[PDB]
Design an enzyme around this catalytic site. Structure first.
Site, PDB file in Angstrom:
ATOM      1  N   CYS A 119       0.811  -1.216   0.000  1.00 23.22           N
ATOM      2  CA  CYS A 119       0.000   0.000   0.000  1.00 23.22           C
ATOM      3  C   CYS A 119       0.848   1.271   0.000  1.00 23.22           C
ATOM      4  O   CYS A 119       1.603   1.513   0.928  1.00 23.22           O
ATOM      5  CB  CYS A 119      -0.943   0.032   1.214  1.00 23.22           C
ATOM      6  SG  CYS A 119      -1.988   1.506   1.238  1.00 23.22           S
ATOM      7  N   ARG A 122      -0.097   4.575   2.935  1.00 29.03           N
ATOM      8  CA  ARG A 122      -0.038   4.343   4.380  1.00 29.03           C
ATOM      9  C   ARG A 122       0.296   5.544   5.264  1.00 29.03           C
ATOM     10  O   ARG A 122       0.250   5.409   6.477  1.00 29.03           O
ATOM     11  CB  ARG A 122       0.966   3.235   4.690  1.00 29.03           C
ATOM     12  CG  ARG A 122       0.450   1.827   4.394  1.00 29.03           C
ATOM     13  CD  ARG A 122       1.540   0.809   4.703  1.00 29.03           C
ATOM     14  NE  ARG A 122       2.458   0.677   3.582  1.00 29.03           N
ATOM     15  CZ  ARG A 122       3.631   0.056   3.651  1.00 29.03           C
ATOM     16  NH1 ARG A 122       4.038  -0.467   4.796  1.00 29.03           N
ATOM     17  NH2 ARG A 122       4.386  -0.044   2.573  1.00 29.03           N
ATOM     18  N   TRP A 291      -9.465   6.195  -0.488  1.00 31.99           N
ATOM     19  CA  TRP A 291      -9.762   6.895  -1.726  1.00 31.99           C
ATOM     20  C   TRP A 291      -8.755   6.462  -2.801  1.00 31.99           C
ATOM     21  O   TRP A 291      -7.720   5.869  -2.495  1.00 31.99           O
ATOM     22  CB  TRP A 291      -9.729   8.413  -1.517  1.00 31.99           C
ATOM     23  CG  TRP A 291      -8.492   8.927  -0.850  1.00 31.99           C
ATOM     24  CD1 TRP A 291      -7.289   9.197  -1.445  1.00 31.99           C
ATOM     25  CD2 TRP A 291      -8.336   9.255   0.534  1.00 31.99           C
ATOM     26  NE1 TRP A 291      -6.398   9.665  -0.516  1.00 31.99           N
ATOM     27  CE2 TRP A 291      -7.012   9.714   0.708  1.00 31.99           C
ATOM     28  CE3 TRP A 291      -9.185   9.203   1.647  1.00 31.99           C
ATOM     29  CZ2 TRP A 291      -6.515  10.115   1.948  1.00 31.99           C
ATOM     30  CZ3 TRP A 291      -8.690   9.601   2.880  1.00 31.99           C
ATOM     31  CH2 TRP A 291      -7.368  10.050   3.020  1.00 31.99           C
ATOM     32  N   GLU A 296      -5.090   3.910 -10.591  1.00 32.08           N
ATOM     33  CA  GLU A 296      -5.811   2.659 -10.359  1.00 32.08           C
ATOM     34  C   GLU A 296      -7.001   2.559 -11.312  1.00 32.08           C
ATOM     35  O   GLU A 296      -7.364   1.473 -11.751  1.00 32.08           O
ATOM     36  CB  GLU A 296      -6.304   2.551  -8.923  1.00 32.08           C
ATOM     37  CG  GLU A 296      -5.239   2.429  -7.872  1.00 32.08           C
ATOM     38  CD  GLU A 296      -5.859   2.337  -6.481  1.00 32.08           C
ATOM     39  OE1 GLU A 296      -6.139   1.203  -6.044  1.00 32.08           O
ATOM     40  OE2 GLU A 296      -6.076   3.392  -5.841  1.00 32.08           O
TER      41      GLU A 296
END
Ligand code: HEM
Ligand code: HEM
Ligand SMILES: Cc1cc(N)nc2cc(-c3cccc(CN)c3)ccc12
Ligand SMILES: Cc1cc(N)nc2cc(-c3cccc(CN)c3)ccc12
Ligand SMILES: C[C@H](O)[C@H](O)[C@H]1CNc2nc(N)[nH]c(=O)c2N1
Ligand SMILES: C[C@H](O)[C@H](O)[C@H]1CNc2nc(N)[nH]c(=O)c2N1
Ligand SMILES: [Zn+2]
Lengths: 421, 419
Positions: A119, A122, A291, A296
């Site tokens: 991720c 973070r 979000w 992506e």
């Protein structure tokens, strides 16, 4: 086993020293003689459903986590710490399991995020609304919890990161599961002629839904129903109230024709098929949302060949030379698409972050973690954005990857394992 | 210990790796920590102090001889036995041994073949090998290098080549090309704190100046060759300019692009690595191919710590540079790479775009799994520095492991050399 491992940034020359890796718990897949860093699911990032922890296995895992918890709140070795140890142990001994305190559940969820190597978002890990749904007993109940989560997280566009946690695994025949891979995803439909309508990624699950009774509109962007399993019972279908599903039509600041492509996406990315492990306990249903990073949607969801695959049509409307690859027509189109996604989200005031900002924030987050924690496990293969890799700062940043607990893990699709009633 | 599978998530093709079972070198990872994004783990490098012994050398020699005779389907032949015998008698009486010419060629091709970070490996067996093991002086080196550069340039129709100078002996008599590449541009630390030319080469440039090189102090000055033979002090040589093929970068739509005054050289020729074969170490072995456009267009031109041209281009493109979310960098980056490809192609200089190259590499993988049982590959280096996931290698799972013969990193000679 060296106490200190160093990483270098090759653009700034900043060198960081990692000690946190000494706390690493599980295997990576790699060995001394092979690296599996680009393997998407090595056997250790997953969790098979029927190997439920024995009493003997669970004791040291719980203690490990409890110690970590009391250490974090600066009460390590305290009377409350020792008393909690004894309570958990007594509880494991007489019930083969134990219940987390609310504080512990909140701490564990936040740290599963903090520990998530893949991720890039973070820096936000400490701001996570945790919804405790461990009193849930039915799929209607799960639906109620999920609606509330979606509304809270959406917040009319000002998105807030959140997680909802259903009851932990017991004997493995009573799992809570969200069969959806995300709370909000669009349907895909295989046509008799071999073509695909909607999102090719979701064909299989769409079919399962239709088998379970879902009447499909059969369009390009049909929001899938929730398919929800409580306490090991057969899953059940629910339509999410449409007013709870915030969407953004995609338009472009310069190309008036871009809106004619009829594209849109949903604002709330909410992964719902992963497993949350805290102190040896397994929360098989734990939907979490934040979000979007623009890529992506703009690179992967739209331009992947096995997804919406819109590069060709965009390039055509851009009147690019599509005969030679060396014209970089794909690259040219890819950028414009990602420009439109960012522009459309910002215009509708729906939270989104571009891959430049997100990666710079991540580098800052990583540095702070090294300072205050002794490290930050990171998966470079996932951290680097799918476009413009080297012009983002994470490309030049050496990373160490390792698995800390609490963690989010992959789990098998529930339709492969479910014993139908 | 098993057969490992790699999946391509785009095509769902599954390959089975058995080749990794042969590997001997370490990768850097352990069971609990992956170091797949470390650029130089302790295991991809070769310190000159770590020179072999008789005891260490023969097993490595036997391993390579054994694999060579297996590759030519003569494992356990009379020739194979005699060779093993020959090599042992030789390590005994000299503490080293010399490769046969066949062995040297086989060894260099396979070092390329096994280079897990190279996307260009479908070409691996088309390699011109120049044996320079008879070289004794820096002048000799310069001669060999000129011949290499001339052969490989081939008027723009580039040909892959490697030139192999004498192997390391005791480590006090190393041959080294001090240049990181045969052809590179100089960098100059300006009084006003900034850098003129290529910041990658500021240090090397200083040493050339310190050694007597008279710098033009331009933005693209070809550096002198700085050549070390048999452990002696390095010597400077000017590559004859007619041997140095360059391309002026222009854009097919943007007539103002040529006005940026950008150019680059045609021949990528890495000269600072170490070739290891059968336990022998070749500290000087410059090798050259042709460019993937992103090497120049993405990294060389747009790295912050390199020529850093994105701002200028975006300025000329009149883009809104106030928010990152306008993706103005991404836009300028694509245009620069369009220009680079278009410029080389217009000059009929061999170059490959990253779509074409990643495509060839996927085919190469399939070939290798079929005939070799695998292909070691470093996803972190294989995936191009722009547009990653719209090239097929992004979705290709890869296993990385270390086979020998290999190309290894080695320390820069100025960090070791006593003058
Ligand atoms: C707040 C904004 C967030 C952003 C911008 C963000 C960004 C991202 C991105 C871009 C990815 C890669 C996605 C992909 O390639 O499919 C990712 C992966 C991931 N994110 Fe985050 N995320 C956010 C919030 C969260 C939250 C709230 C959680 C959990 C509480 C989380 C946990 C994860 C996990 C576990 C993965 C990778 C899972 C795996 O494959 O191992 N993220 N994130
Ligand atoms: C024929 C055309 C070739 C192409 C298109 C090509 C392409 C590439 C590219 C794009 C890289 C990454 C470079 C970087 O990111 O800085 C690379 C690395 C590399 N290439 Fe190739 N290459 C070619 C030929 C060769 C040859 C002839 C050799 C040796 C005989 C070779 C050996 C290597 C090695 C050893 C590396 C990485 C070194 C390391 O860091 O471990 N390549 N190549
Ligand atoms: C919370 C959150 C926010 C965000 N912006 N992206 C996310 C992506 C993932 C993810 C993880 C593994 C695989 C996939 C493939 N769809 C997606 C998980 C959570 C995310
Ligand atoms: C032969 C050949 C052709 C080509 N097109 N590129 C190459 C790149 C390298 C390379 C290796 C390590 C580090 C760096 C840093 N610039 C570059 C080596 C050989 C190459
Ligand atoms: C930190 C990271 O390993 C480093 O920036 C690597 C990443 N991938 C790369 N990939 C290629 N092809 N070339 C490089 O120089 C690098 N650099
Ligand atoms: C084969 C490879 O590991 C796979 O395609 C990975 C690569 N990196 C990725 N990185 C991110 N962020 N998301 C992904 O889905 C992937 N896919
Ligand atoms: Zn690894």
């Amino acid at each position: 086993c060296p106490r200190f491992l160093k990483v270098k940034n090759w653009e700034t020359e900043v060198v960081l020293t990692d000690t946190l890796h000494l706390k690493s718990t599980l295997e990576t897949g790699c060995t001394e003689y092979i690296c599996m860093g680009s393997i998407m699911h090595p056997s250790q990032h997953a969790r098979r459903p029927e190997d439920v922890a024995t009493k003997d296995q669970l004791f040291p895992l719980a203690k490990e986590f409890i110690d970590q918890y009391y250490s974090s709140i600066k009460r390590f070795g305290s009377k409350a710490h020792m008393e909690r140890l004894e309570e958990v142990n007594k509880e494991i001994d007489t019930t083969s399991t134990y219940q987390l305190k609310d504080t512990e559940l909140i701490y564990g969820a936040k740290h599963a995020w903090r520990n998530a190597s893949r991720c890039v978002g973070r820096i936000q890990w400490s701001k996570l609304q945790v919804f405790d749904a461990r009193d849930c007993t039915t799929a209607h109940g799960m639906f109620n919890y999920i609606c509330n989560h979606v509304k809270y997280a959406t917040n009319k566009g000002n998105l807030r990161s959140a997680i909802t946690i259903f009851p932990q695994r017991t004997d493995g025949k009573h799992d809570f599961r969200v069969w959806n891979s995300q709370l909000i995803r669009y349907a895909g439909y295989k046509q008799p002629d071999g073509s695909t309508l909607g999102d090719p990624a979701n064909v299989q699950f769409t079919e399962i839904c239709i088998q379970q009774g879902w009447k499909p509109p059969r369009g390009r962007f049909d929001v899938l129903p929730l398919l929800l399993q409580a306490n090991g019972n057969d899953p059940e279908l629910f339509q999410i109230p449409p007013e709870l599903v915030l969407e953004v039509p995609i338009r472009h600041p310069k190309f008036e024709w871009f809106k004619d492509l009829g594209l849109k996406w949903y604002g709330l990315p909410a992964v719902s098929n992963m497993l949350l492990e805290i102190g040896g306990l397994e929360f098989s249903a734990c939907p979490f949302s934040g979000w979007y990073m623009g890529t992506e949607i703009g690179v992967r969801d739209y331009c992947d060949n096995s997804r919406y695959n819109i590069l060709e049509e965009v390039a055509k409307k851009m009147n690019l030379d599509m005969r030679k690859t060396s014209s970089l027509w794909k690259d040219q189109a890819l950028v414009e698409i990602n420009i439109a996604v960012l522009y459309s989200f910002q215009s509708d005031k729906v939270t989104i972050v571009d891959h430049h900002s997100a990666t710079e924030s991540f580098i800052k987050h990583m540095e702070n973690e090294y300072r205050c924690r002794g490290g930050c496990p990171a998966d470079w293969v996932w951290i680097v954005p799918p476009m413009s890799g080297s012009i983002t700062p994470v490309f030049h940043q050496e990373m160490l990857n390792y698995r800390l607990t609490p963690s989010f893990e992959y789990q098998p699709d529930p339709w492969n394992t479910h014993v139908w009633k």
